[PDB]
Amino acid sequence: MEVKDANSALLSNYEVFQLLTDLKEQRKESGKNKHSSGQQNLNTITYETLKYISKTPCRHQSPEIVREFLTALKSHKLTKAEKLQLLNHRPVTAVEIQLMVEESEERLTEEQIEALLHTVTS
Amino acid sequence: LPDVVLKPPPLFPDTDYKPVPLKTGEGEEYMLALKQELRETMKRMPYFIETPEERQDIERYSKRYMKVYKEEWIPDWRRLPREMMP
Amino acid sequence: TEGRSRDGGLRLGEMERDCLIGYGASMLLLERLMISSDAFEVDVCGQCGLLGYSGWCHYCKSSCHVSSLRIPYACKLLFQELQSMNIIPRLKLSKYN
Amino acid sequence: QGRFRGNLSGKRVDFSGRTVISPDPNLRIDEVAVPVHVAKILTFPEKVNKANINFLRKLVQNGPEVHPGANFIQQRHTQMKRFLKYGNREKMAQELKYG
Amino acid sequence: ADFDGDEMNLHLPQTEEAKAEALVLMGTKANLVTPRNGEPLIAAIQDFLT
Amino acid sequence: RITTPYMTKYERARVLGTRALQIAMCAPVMVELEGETDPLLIAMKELKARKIPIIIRRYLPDGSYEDWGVDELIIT
Amino acid sequence: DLMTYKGEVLGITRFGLAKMKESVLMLASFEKTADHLFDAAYFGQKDSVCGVSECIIMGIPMNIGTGLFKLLHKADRDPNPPKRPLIFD
Amino acid sequence: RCPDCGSTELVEDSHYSQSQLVCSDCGCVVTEGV
Amino acid sequence: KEQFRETDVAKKISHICFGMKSPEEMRQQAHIQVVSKNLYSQDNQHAP
Amino acid sequence: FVLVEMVDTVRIPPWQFERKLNDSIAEELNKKLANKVVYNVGLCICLFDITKLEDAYVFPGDGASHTKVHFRCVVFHPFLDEILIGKIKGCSPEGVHVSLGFFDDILIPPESLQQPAKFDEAEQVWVWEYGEEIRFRVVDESFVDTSPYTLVGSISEPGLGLLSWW
RNA sequence: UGCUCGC
Numbered sequence: 001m002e003v004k005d006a007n008s009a010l011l012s013n014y015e016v017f018q019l020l021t022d023l024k025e026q027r028k029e030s031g032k033n034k035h036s037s038g039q040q041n042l043n044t045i046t047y048e049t050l051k052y053i054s055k056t057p058c059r060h061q062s063p064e065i066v067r068e069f070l071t072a073l074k075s076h077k078l079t080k081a082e083k084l085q086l087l088n089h090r091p092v093t094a095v096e097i098q099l100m101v102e103e104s105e106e107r108l109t110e111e112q113i114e115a116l117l118h119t120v121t122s
Numbered sequence: 123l124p125d126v127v128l129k130p131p132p133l134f135p136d137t138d139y140k141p142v143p144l145k146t147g148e149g150e151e152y153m154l155a156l157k158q159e160l161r162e163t164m165k166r167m168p169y170f171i172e173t174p175e176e177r178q179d180i181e182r183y184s185k186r187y188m189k190v191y192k193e194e195w196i197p198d199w200r201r202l203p204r205e206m207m208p
Numbered sequence: 209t210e211g212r213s214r215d216g217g218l219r220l221g222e223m224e225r226d227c228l229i230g231y232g233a234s235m236l237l238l239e240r241l242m243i244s245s246d247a248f249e250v251d252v253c254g255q256c257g258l259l260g261y262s263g264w265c266h267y268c269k270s271s272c273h274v275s276s277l278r279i280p281y282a283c284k285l286l287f288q289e290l291q292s293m294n295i296i297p298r299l300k301l302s303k304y305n
Numbered sequence: 306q307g308r309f310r311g312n313l314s315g316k317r318v319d320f321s322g323r324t325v326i327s328p329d330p331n332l333r334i335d336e337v338a339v340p341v342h343v344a345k346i347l348t349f350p351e352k353v354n355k356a357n358i359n360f361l362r363k364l365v366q367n368g369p370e371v372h373p374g375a376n377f378i379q380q381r382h383t384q385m386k387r388f389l390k391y392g393n394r395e396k397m398a399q400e401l402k403y404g
Numbered sequence: 405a406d407f408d409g410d411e412m413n414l415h416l417p418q419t420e421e422a423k424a425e426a427l428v429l430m431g432t433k434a435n436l437v438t439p440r441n442g443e444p445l446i447a448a449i450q451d452f453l454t
Numbered sequence: 455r456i457t458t459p460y461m462t463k464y465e466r467a468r469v470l471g472t473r474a475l476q477i478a479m480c481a482p483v484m485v486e487l488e489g490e491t492d493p494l495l496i497a498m499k500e501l502k503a504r505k506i507p508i509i510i511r512r513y514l515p516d517g518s519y520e521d522w523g524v525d526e527l528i529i530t
Numbered sequence: 531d532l533m534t535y536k537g538e539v540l541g542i543t544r545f546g547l548a549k550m551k552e553s554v555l556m557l558a559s560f561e562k563t564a565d566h567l568f569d570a571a572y573f574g575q576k577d578s579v580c581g582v583s584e585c586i587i588m589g590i591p592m593n594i595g596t597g598l599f600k601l602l603h604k605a606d607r608d609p610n611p612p613k614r615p616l617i618f619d
Numbered sequence: 620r621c622p623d624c625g626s627t628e629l630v631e632d633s634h635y636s637q638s639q640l641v642c643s644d645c646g647c648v649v650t651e652g653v
Numbered sequence: 654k655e656q657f658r659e660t661d662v663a664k665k666i667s668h669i670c671f672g673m674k675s676p677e678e679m680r681q682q683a684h685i686q687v688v689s690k691n692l693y694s695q696d697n698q699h700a701p
Numbered sequence: 702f703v704l705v706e707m708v709d710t711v712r713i714p715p716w717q718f719e720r721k722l723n724d725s726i727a728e729e730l731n732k733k734l735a736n737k738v739v740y741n742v743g744l745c746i747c748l749f750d751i752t753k754l755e756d757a758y759v760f761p762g763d764g765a766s767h768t769k770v771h772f773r774c775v776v777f778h779p780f781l782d783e784i785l786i787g788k789i790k791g792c793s794p795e796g797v798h799v800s801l802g803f804f805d806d807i808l809i810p811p812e813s814l815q816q817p818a819k820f821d822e823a824e825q826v827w828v829w830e831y832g833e834e835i836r837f838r839v840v841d842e843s844f845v846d847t848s849p850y851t852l853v854g855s856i857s858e859p860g861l862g863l864l865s866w867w
Numbered sequence: 868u869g870c871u872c873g874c
């Protein structure tokens with residue numbers, strides 16, 4: 001039951017949303033009585049996590065959009081955590097990048113923020 | 123005949139003899155202070171090799187600011203055999 | 209038990225075990241001498257190799273490395289008697305794979 | 306009579322009987338005749354499956370008195386054994402779940 | 405055996421695997437010859453030879 | 455491929471035992487039994503019909519192994 | 531061949547059996563139980579379960595007989611299934 | 620009491636050299652083996 | 654919420670490592686110290 | 702959210718042999734790792750994929766099918782600086798009780814870093830004015846069995862401004 | 868523990 005690596009690869013909320021939708025549809029297409037009665041925590045966690053993701057703006061996303069966003073942010077020398085947070089949150093306001101996003105000092109430059117907003121809104 | 127005991131003997135039996143108090147003087151205090159100074163100064167010595175930290179969570183811009191820097195002594199490879207070169 | 213008046217069972221002697229070995233029936237020998245006679249489930253600690261109780265090791269004062277194990281009861285009695293004789297058997301468990 | 310020779314290499318087991326032998330040529334060489342009395346005592350645990358369900362139902366209905374039958378029922382969910390000499394055996398046979 | 409009062413034991417396996425191993429390896433039809441020299445032991449006896 | 459192509463009696467006994475234990479635990483039948491309430495008889499029928507879904511993993515003493523199907527082996 | 535496989539004719543007695551075999555449990559079970567057990571405890575000799583006698587004692591299937599090989603299930607499967615691609619990485 | 624039906628008709632009836640305290644109503648084996 | 658712990662593992666014993674125990678290990682393994690030479694109580698119940 | 706590589710010995714009973722092996726393996730792994738927190742790993746959500754699946758043995762014991770399966774599963778484990786958006790599912794005098802939406806009621810922010818108008822008078826009063834943001838700080842796990850929870854984490858709410866809500 | 872038996 002040992003784990004090989006707990007930090008193998010960070011993934012955004014879109015992959016989790018797609019996985020939850022696929023698992024939900026495969027479950028509703030292959031619903032089993034005894035398998036469900038054995039453990040009902042699976043259905044609960046899946047449904048509640050899917051609902052939480054639906055409450056977020058994580059919808060209207062596609063792998064092509066994620067790849068375009070990554071290629072756009074690769075020119076800004078930002079770290080993986082910053083772009084991950086920007087993709088998961090999808091900031092529409094600048095103040096979210098100004099104060100909430102860490103490593104603000106010497107990174108905003110007061111000119112790159114407009115480009116970041118234009119990229120995240122596209 | 124010896125009597126029976128209901129409870130086991132105490133884990134730390136008492137003794138009527140106590141340890142002699144330590145020697146006093148400027149010499150003992152100076153040696154104590156010097157031993158404390160050696161304890162404090164030998165851990166920061168490059169000979170004190172610490173356990174190499176591993177499994178970094180992420181890379182960050184603050185890495186260069188928090189990067190631990192310490193001078194490393196160069197062993198004399200003439201006296202040391204060849205098998206210990208990096 | 210031994211006798212019929214004591215409602216005893218028939219004994220598989222050493223020569224019967226030899227015959228079962230010669231036949232090569234490992235599962236039948238296992239069922240006869242372990243499953244049907246003195247089967248028991250003990251708790252062994254994977255750290256010190258000693259026998260625990262109720263999923264707990266009193267020696268190490270922990271319960272993370274304690275695991276269940278099927279064993280003949282006579283084998284557990286032998287292990288306990290050997291521990292009484294200062295001949296401590298330390299069992300290094302491992303996965304069946 | 307030590308542990309190794311008397312309790313490890315050779316030990317006593319249950320589900321066994323001992324009886325005097327008598328000749329019977331009308332049986333095949335791979336067959337052996339067992340008395341009804343010993344057959345009612347030595348029991349075999351059969352698992353309820355989709356094949357022998359209707360046979361085990363009749364065996365339970367017969368009970369521990371008729372020779373073709375059973376003596377105990379162990380449920381799949383709970384491991385509490387049930388004696389067939391007491392209780393309604395028909396209700397037990399009608400409630401024979403797989404496993 | 406000689407049927408002059410000999411008592412014999414009869415064991416019932418409690419496992420399907422053990423039952424199958426007993427029937428296959430220790431079957432009467434599969435052990436008609438001894439492994440010592442291959443001679444058949446299960447054969448005709450008195451009142452069958454005569 | 456270097457071992458004997460004939461299926462030994464020990465392999466037969468173990469395969470029949472495992473198949474009977476599985477069938478007794480509500481395993482699917484592949485020979486369409488006809489009133490056989492004994493799992494060992496069903497296992498023998500599957501062996502004679504060569505429909506047992508079990509692959510023997512013969513291990514060499516050094517550590518090497520090889521897989522042989524029941525239908526691939528020769529029965530007597 | 532068993533008596534003459536170590537280069538010296540070793541008998542079936544306890545001495546030859548000890549010189550041939552290595553399993554502590556079998557040596558203890560055959561003869562000289564206490565002496566062999568105390569000697570093993572002194573040497574700290576770890577005894578495996580490769581032999582038949584220790585397999586019988588510990589209640590595990592012996593390596594000889596039907597237990598020499600292992601069985602595999604011919605289940606409908608697909609080794610190395612297709613992996614879901616990672617979009618963020 | 621019986622663990623299944625809750626009855627108090629627990630009788631000690633030995634069945635072929637097997638001591639067994641069993642419920643007399645539903646036949647549930649309460650305890651067995653001595 | 655709930656911590657994941659394994660219920661049962663199919664553990665198989667590999668080998669038995671014989672050895673000896675120090676008096677400290679004997680104290681650590683044991684639960685109680687036996688100091689009374691008698692077996693039962695003086696009362697008629699004869700409790701240990 | 703992050704992927705974790707695990708290797709598990711899954712036992713499938715014989716009455717599931719008609720089913721596909723990979724589907725039943727995934728179902729069993731999901732049933733075994735649902736709503737559970739692995740120590741020093743985090744709360745696992747579900748199975749992401751199955752990378753390696755080797756041969757399926759059958760033991761001389763139970764007789765079921767034992768398969769060693771290598772898989773990757775998604776878990777919830779911040780990187781000590783991640784930003785989250787939760788909802789206030791209660792409040793205590795020593796600290797508010799914020800819960801990620803239907804995810805886990807384990808986030809306990811200490812009220813010791815906001816502007817000096819911080820207090821909770823047991824009337825569910827959040828903060829005196831001048832979707833709740835969260836900055837995870839440290840992870841912490843603990844055991845359960847110690848005789849014959851496990852994930853709380855600390856939450857920071859700095860002077861973020863919050864032009865939308867004070 | 869002893870002993871008489873049963874092959």
Ligand SMILES: Nc1nc2c(ncn2[C@@H]2O[C@H](COP(=O)(O)OP(=O)(O)OP(=O)(O)O)[C@@H](O)[C@H]2O)c(=O)[nH]1
Pocket residue numbers: 868
């Ligand atoms: N003199 C004598 N000694 C006996 C008797 N029964 C047992 N022993 C001794 O006890 C040892 C064997 O004990 P067991 O026969 O196993 O005792 P047990 O039958 O388990 O005793 P219970 O548990 O009371 O049935 C032998 O070494 C004998 O010396 C007896 O009837 N007379």
Ligand SMILES: Nc1ncnc2c1ncn2[C@@H]1O[C@H](COP(=O)(O)OP(=O)(O)OP(=O)(O)O)C[C@H]1O
Pocket residue numbers: 874
């Ligand atoms: N001490 C013993 N050990 C093993 N088997 C024994 C023992 N005593 C009797 N038996 C059993 O009884 C059988 C002995 O019979 P056997 O010696 O062949 O005929 P018999 O007793 O000489 O009869 P006759 O005197 O020839 O009429 C063989 C054996 O299985």
Ligand SMILES: [Mg+2]
Pocket residue numbers: 405406407408409410874
């Ligand atoms: Mg005779």
Ligand SMILES: [Zn+2]
Pocket residue numbers: 253254255256257258265267268269
């Ligand atoms: Zn321990």
